[PDB]
Write a protein that binds this ligand. Structure first.
Ligand code: BCL
Ligand code: BCL
Ligand code: BCL
Ligand SMILES: CC[C@H]1c2cc3[nH]c4c(c3C)C(=O)[C@H](C(=O)OC)c4c3nc(cc4[nH]c(cc(n2)[C@@H]1C)c(C(C)=O)c4C)[C@@H](C)[C@@H]3CCC(=O)OC/C=C(/C)CCC[C@@H](C)CCC[C@@H](C)CCCC(C)C
Ligand SMILES: CC[C@H]1c2cc3[nH]c4c(c3C)C(=O)[C@H](C(=O)OC)c4c3nc(cc4[nH]c(cc(n2)[C@@H]1C)c(C(C)=O)c4C)[C@@H](C)[C@@H]3CCC(=O)OC/C=C(\C)CCC[C@@H](C)CCC[C@@H](C)CCCC(C)C
Ligand SMILES: COC1=C(OC)C(=O)C(C/C=C(\C)CC/C=C(\C)CC/C=C(\C)CC/C=C(\C)CC/C=C(\C)CC/C=C(\C)CC/C=C(\C)CC/C=C(\C)CC/C=C(\C)CCC=C(C)C)=C(C)C1=O
Ligand SMILES: COC1=C(OC)C(=O)C(C/C=C(\C)CC/C=C(\C)CC/C=C(\C)CC/C=C(\C)CC/C=C(\C)CC/C=C(\C)CC/C=C(\C)CC/C=C(\C)CC/C=C(\C)CCC=C(C)C)=C(C)C1=O
Ligand SMILES: COC(C)(C)C(=O)C/C=C(\C)CC/C=C(\C)CC/C=C(\C)CCCC/C(C)=C/CC[C@H](C)CC/C=C(\C)CCC=C(C)C
Ligand SMILES: CCCCCCCCCCCC[N+](C)(C)[O-]
Ligand SMILES: CCCCCCCCCCCC[N+](C)(C)[O-]
Ligand SMILES: CCCCCCCCCCCC[N+](C)(C)[O-]
Ligand SMILES: CCCCCCCCCCCC[N+](C)(C)[O-]
Ligand SMILES: CCCCCCCCCCCC[N+](C)(C)[O-]
Ligand SMILES: CCCCCCCCCCCC[N+](C)(C)[O-]
Ligand SMILES: CCCCCCCCCCCC[N+](C)(C)[O-]
Ligand SMILES: CCCCCCCCCCCC[N+](C)(C)[O-]
Ligand SMILES: [Cl-]
Ligand SMILES: [Fe+3]
Lengths: 241, 281, 302
């Protein structure tokens, strides 16, 4: 056998170990598998858990070690629809309020993400030095329309990402005078309004709310983004088209 | 078996067809109506490719090939041994890809995410349909489409391109290669930049989205940003497949001569055409 | 319709970002260039600043010298006639020394001594630029991933113009500088070697390039699909898993019966792409040095 035939045989062996490395490298969240009852699954599949690695998080926020002991750290309201594995799980309540399905949120650190300088990554624009709208229609002051074609509230500020300089949320004011953050990726900015297809007008009050008006925390975001996305499924009887 | 975080997302709903009938999983795999269609099509055609592996005579995979109807059958049907199998199997594969895509849509609605993935998968499906369907129909014969075989279909890439000279000269093909080359460069970078960050020098702290911006602004003097590089990747990719389908829809229809010759339009432009000097004067 | 997050609806601008400092030398960063509203619809609107140090200028000078050297010879070919120059632009070529000059530098200017000059500048440009990638990573405290990946590309380039030419015994084996000419060289190369479609590394290289498009398509779409949960902010999804990362993983588990992690998918990414040129360069380097005809080799060792 010649030189080329070695290089090619040698390669296929390299490639498999790579696939193995990659596959295991990708088991650092979500594993070991569970039965729907939360106990460890009998079948883990052919690949072993990797050895843990440890991330040092900036600004004294500690470390993360993956893979690690895993859990939701929250009550999940759902119940089996059938007597064997592999079926859907019926929500035991209001799925939006309960935070299940498309309405799901992870329980992330309840603390805002910080920029590399240790400052909040996300500010309402009003408190963001020298930040303004550079291009496109300015949404501020527009009324907000829910998918029921009713007016949910009005836009009172844009929450921006300081180091990436983009708009992450529209702060929206409801009838009672309190506000809510709407994911920027989940609204349509029109010339005469801002439209939200995911939520009906009446569902706007239900949006999870933040603690400090000047900042928002990872956990809070997840609850907000989760709830909003969930309306795509759960608001369908209120969506006209 | 479920991922540790999985159960909270497996909830009734999201289906395009049949309500709660097919709404359930087998192991990890979501099923739904289009899971079922996909199986049907994919398995039917897989049985049919197994059968052509009889009429051909061999069970070896480097060998088995299903050739299209010959150029004399035109757009009509052909006997199963004579390329009729191909037509069915082709129809089958179209059935499995489209089912697969809409299945992803169904999976999408249930997860409350956007449809971007099966939208992007559409372009692949679309490229394939160009080669096996659109281009053959514009041309008049099924036989102009590529055979299904590991090596023999490669023969058809060579045969086809060399009909037109060195195929490098198809201009849509050029734009296609430019997008692939760039995508792969952009994939390499993107992957590197997130990795260099999450896994910085030994014992240091994780870097930040700012460190990423900084690195590239340091390096090339511009950073496209973390929303942009995903926009970029998606765009570079789909553009490559778009110009691939295009480069091949125009070849054998609007342009059938040697592609290199298409370029004389520029060179015979009246202002510089007859000037002496250079290569063409 | 639903907003799909392909183009920005409202751009927003603050002060210019001068970047993170760490161990970088600030003397060698420029001031911030202007702001493109054009770019802002897709990516960031800010150009600059840029770090140009000693190794930076060496690279940036060399690469211009490589480029200018080709252009001068291109003008000569055009007979210094601007209208010809633009007409024949893809047809011009700066070719390497003929095979009789072997690996020697003694070949005349018009005979491809020019081409060796131009290559030298290119050689310097890339390798300096390579270390530039490492260096900027070092100063930020980051991984050398970018530079290790860029090596993979340098590999194919090093094989086409340099290493394979040495091994074959001449510079004439190298690639000419020109648009159509180099395209021809590519196609002529395949024929001379008995059809690279028979080269197993070539086939693999293709698989990775297609796969690169397939992967990045998947990935990019996936991040946009989950950008409603803050998906694109990947480093913090790594440090603390979000509902973005979760439904991202689960789309793919429910579809193909397995999935990735917010960190893991980038290992897939870097390797998918890197393997393209990696296998590519092996495929080329083995061609003519060892394997004469890929169809023929493939008749036995297949
Ligand atoms: C000598 C031959 C000619 C030549 C002749 C041709 C010809 C002929 C064609 C190309 C095409 C292409 N050529 Mg060319 N090409 C040449 C030289 C090159 C060179 C080079 C370095 O020299 C490059 C980089 C390229 C690059 C390209 C791309 C633009 C394109 C292939 C991508 C594509 O279309 O994907 C599209 C992707 C698909 C079609 C995949 C579809 C996937 C489907 C939907 C899903 C399948 C699922 C599967 C069944 C799953 C299996 C089941 C598993 C269990 C999961 N060519 C030479 C000069 N080239 C082709 C093209 O553009 O066609 C559109 C084409 O037809
Ligand atoms: C797109 C332009 C040309 C084309 C040009 C080339 C060229 C040129 C080459 C290939 C090569 C390949 N092509 Mg082809 N190929 C075409 C269209 C197809 C289609 C299709 C239905 O459209 C398929 C399934 C394939 C399949 C293949 C693979 C056997 C191989 C690597 C693909 C890859 O890695 O992509 C990236 C995708 C992934 C990594 C995902 C995994 C996809 C797996 C590998 C597909 C396996 C299919 C299996 C062999 C057969 C499926 C049928 C089963 C019975 C169900 N080609 C058209 C005609 N293709 C290379 C080769 O190795 O040839 C021997 C090669 O050099
Ligand atoms: C007639 C045409 C021949 C053919 C001949 C060849 C030859 C010859 C080669 C390839 C190679 C490739 N071919 Mg082939 N190829 C054919 C048919 C195909 C088909 C097809 C559809 O039929 C496809 C899809 C491909 C695909 C491919 C790619 C997978 C591979 C290129 C890798 C790459 O990304 O390089 C692009 C990346 C680089 C070239 C790296 C460059 C890195 C350097 C450092 C960058 C320097 C930049 C410089 C400083 C300028 C800066 C400018 C800035 C603006 C400042 N070939 C047929 C059979 N093909 C290459 C290979 O590896 O083969 C194994 C190769 O050598
Ligand atoms: C291995 C997988 C892919 C890959 C990866 C890859 N490439 C890379 C990297 C990586 C990981 C880098 O880190 C590195 C980089 O820094 O890119 C941002 C790079 C790079 N790959 C590049 C290009 C490139 N990559 C290619 C391919 C690939 N790269 C593979 C597909 C190709 C192809 C397909 O052939 C090309 C052409 C560069 C962008 C960069 C390396 C640049 C370099 O070496 O710099 C040389 C320095 C110079 C100064 C060059 C001269 C510049 C002139 C041509 C300018 C012309 C205009 C000017 C005269 C006037 C302008 C005035 C205006 C006012 C108009
Ligand atoms: C458009 C950008 C790129 C792209 C995107 C893309 N592909 C995708 C997706 C996306 C976004 C998916 O979501 C989906 C997926 O699940 O990805 C893992 C997919 C996918 N693209 C795939 C492959 C693939 N993509 C390719 C390319 C591309 N896809 C583009 C480069 C290629 C190339 C370049 O050759 C291949 C081979 C699959 C992994 C998956 C679609 C799987 C699917 O549809 O499953 C249903 C069908 C079956 C299980 C089998 C049916 C088979 C039988 C009917 C017989 C075989 C048909 C016949 C044509 C045989 C051909 C034999 C070959 C030797 C020619
Ligand atoms: C957050 O950090 C970041 C990372 O991510 C973690 C990244 O890694 C990166 C790095 C990424 C890059 C900078 C990659 C660079 C690539 C680009 C900026 C894309 C540029 C696009 C091209 C070069 C494509 C060129 C293709 C051409 C020239 C052909 C296109 C022509 C047309 C579409 C028009 C054709 C004519 C018409 C109208 C139709 C007629 C067509 C016929 C043929 C007929 C950055 C910067 C980033 O900072
Ligand atoms: C950040 O986010 C991201 C993740 O998550 C956090 C991800 O995971 C992923 C997903 C990507 C990866 C895990 C990386 C690896 C990806 C590739 C190398 C691309 C190639 C992938 C494949 C070859 C897998 C192909 C397998 C397929 C298409 C399924 C085949 C399965 C069968 C054998 C049967 C199919 C089941 C059927 C027929 C459907 C109906 C079901 C019944 C059983 C009935 C991406 C993109 C991502 O961006
Ligand atoms: C009006 O225009 C002006 C005057 C401004 C210009 O100057 C314009 C200039 C042009 C328009 C130039 C156009 C340039 C091109 C068309 C570029 C074409 C280039 C390619 C197609 C590149 C393809 C591949 C090239 C490769 C593979 C080269 C590899 C290089 C080697 C690795 C380098 C090896 C170095 C050598 C051999 C020398 C070594 C000697 C030592 C001892 C170290
Ligand atoms: C749809 C069938 C799935 C398998 C497709 C082929 C996988 C590619 C790896 C083949 C390995 C070849 N080799 C040289 C190791 O024998
Ligand atoms: C059967 C032996 C397999 C040898 C091949 C090893 C696969 C390479 C794994 C990549 C390693 C990634 N890493 C840890 C260096 O970053
Ligand atoms: C080339 C990409 C395809 C690689 C094939 C990977 C097969 C799936 C392996 C992961 C299995 C996951 N699981 C369910 C066992 O945990
Ligand atoms: C990589 C740069 C690409 C720039 C693409 C330019 C298209 C921008 C989209 C314009 C539409 C913007 N708007 C607000 C009117 O919707
Ligand atoms: C790939 C795109 C590269 C764009 C490079 C833009 C950087 C220009 C920096 C100019 C510096 C401005 N100033 C004031 C110092 O002159
Ligand atoms: C011939 C050069 C081949 C390039 C080597 C592949 C680079 C991939 C980088 C993966 C991880 C990098 N690291 C830090 C482990 O070295
Ligand atoms: C990093 C992901 C790994 C995916 C590897 C894809 C393997 C496809 C097989 C290519 C066929 C090469 N061949 C048969 C010509 O030797
Ligand atoms: C290279 C082409 C091979 C594609 C086939 C991918 C196999 C699917 C693996 C899904 C894992 C299912 N399972 C049983 C391990 O859980
Ligand atoms: Cl959009
Ligand atoms: Fe990413």
């Amino acid at each position: 056998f010649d030189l080329a035939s070695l290089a090619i045989y040698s390669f296929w062996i390299f490639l498999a170990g790579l696939i193995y490395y990659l596959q295991t490298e990708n088991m650092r969240e979500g594993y070991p598998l569970e039965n729907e009852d939360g106990t460890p699954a009998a079948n883990q599949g052919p690949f072993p858990l990797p050895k843990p690695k440890t991330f040092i998080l900036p600004h004294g926020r500690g470390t993360l070690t993956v893979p690690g002991p895993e859990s939701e750290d929250r009550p999940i309201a759902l119940a089996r629809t059938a007597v064997s594995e592999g079926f859907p799980h019926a929500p035991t309540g209001d799925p939006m309020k309960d935070g299940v399905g498309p309405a799901s949120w992870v329980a992330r650190r309840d603390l805002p993400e910080l920029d590399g300088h240790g400052h909040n990554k996300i500010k309402p624009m009003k408190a963001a030095a020298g930040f303004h709208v550079s291009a496109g229609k300015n949404p501020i002051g527009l009324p907000v329309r829910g998918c029921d074609l009713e007016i949910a509230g009005k836009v009172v500020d844009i929450w921006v990402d300081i180091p990436e300089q983009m708009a992450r949320f529209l702060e929206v004011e409801l009838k009672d005078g309190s506000t809510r953050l709407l994911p920027m990726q989940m609204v349509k900015v029109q010339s005469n309004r801002v439209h939200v297809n995911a939520l009906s007008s009446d569902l706007f009050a239900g949006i999870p709310t933040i603690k400090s008006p000047t900042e928002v925390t990872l956990l809070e975001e997840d609850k907000i983004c989760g709830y909003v996305a969930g309306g795509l499924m759960y608001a369908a009887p209120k969506r006209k088209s | 078996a479920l991922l540790s975080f999985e159960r909270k997302y497996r909830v009734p709903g999201g289906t395009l067809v049949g309500g709660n009938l097919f709404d359930f999983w087998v192991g990890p795999f979501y099923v739904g109506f289009f899971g079922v269609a996909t199986f049907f099509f994919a398995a039917l055609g897989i049985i049919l490719i197994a059968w052509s592996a009889v009429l051909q005579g061999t069970w070896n995979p480097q060998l088995i090939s299903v050739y299209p109807p010959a150029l004399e059958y035109g757009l009509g049907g052909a006997p199963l041994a004579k390329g009729g199998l191909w037509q069915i199997i082709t129809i089958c594969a179209t059935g499995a890809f489209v089912s697969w895509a809409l299945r992803e849509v169904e999976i999408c609605r249930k997860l409350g995410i956007g449809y971007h993935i099966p939208f992007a998968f559409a372009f692949a499906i679309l490229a394939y349909l160009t080669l096996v369907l659109f281009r053959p129909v514009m041309m008049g014969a099924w036989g102009y489409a590529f055979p299904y075989g590991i090596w023999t279909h490669l023969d058809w890439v060579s045969n086809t391109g060399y009909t037109y000279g060195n195929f490098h000269y198809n201009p849509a093909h050029m734009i296609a290669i430019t997008f692939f080359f760039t995508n792969a460069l952009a994939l390499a970078l993107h992957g590197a930049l997130v990795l260099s960050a999450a896994n910085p020098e030994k014992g240091k702290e994780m870097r930040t989205p700012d460190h990423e911006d900084t690195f590239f602004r340091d390096l090339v003097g511009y950073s496209i940003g973390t929303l942009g590089i995903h926009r970029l990747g998606l765009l570079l990719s789909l553009s490559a497949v778009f110009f691939s389908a295009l480069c091949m829809i125009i070849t054998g229809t609007i342009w059938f001569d040697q592609w290199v010759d298409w370029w004389q339009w520029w060179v015979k432009l009246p202002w510089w055409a007859n000037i002496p000097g250079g290569i063409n004067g | 319709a639903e907003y799909q997050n392909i183009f920005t609806q409202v751009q927003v601008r603050g002060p210019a970002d001068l970047g993170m400092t760490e161990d970088v030398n600030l003397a060698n960063r420029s001031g911030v260039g202007p702001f493109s509203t054009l770019l802002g619809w897709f990516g960031n609107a800010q150009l600059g600043p840029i770090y140009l140090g000693s190794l930076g200028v060496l690279s940036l000078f060399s690469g211009l010298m490589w480029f200018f050297t080709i252009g001068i010879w291109f003008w000569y070919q055009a007979g210094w006639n601007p209208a010809v120059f633009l007409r024949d632009l893809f047809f011009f070529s700066l070719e390497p020394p003929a095979p009789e000059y072997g690996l020697s530098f003694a070949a005349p200017l018009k005979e491809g001594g020019l081409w060796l000059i131009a290559s030298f500048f290119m050689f310097v440009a890339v390798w300096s630029w390579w270390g530039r990638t490492y260096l900027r990573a070092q100063a930020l405290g980051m991984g050398k991933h970018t530079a290790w990946a860029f090596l993979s590309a340098i590999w194919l380039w090093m094989v086409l113009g340099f290493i394979r030419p040495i091994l074959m015994g001449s510079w004439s084996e190298a690639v000419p500088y020109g648009i159509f000419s180099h395209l021809d060289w590519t196609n002529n190369f395949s024929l001379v070697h008995g059809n690279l479609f028979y080269n197993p590394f070539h086939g693999l290289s293709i698989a990775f390039l297609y796969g690169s498009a397939l992967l990045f398509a998947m990935h990019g779409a996936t991040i946009l699909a989950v950008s409603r949960f803050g998906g694109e902010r990947e480093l913090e999804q790594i440090a603390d898993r979000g509902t973005a990362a979760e439904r991202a993983a689960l789309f793919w588990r429910w579809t193909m019966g397995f999935n990735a992690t917010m960190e893991g998918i980038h290992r897939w990414a870097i390797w998918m792409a890197v393997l393209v040129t990696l296998t590519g360069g092996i495929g080329i380097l083995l061609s003519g040095t060892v394997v004469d005809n890929w169809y023929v080799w493939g008749q036995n060792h297949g």
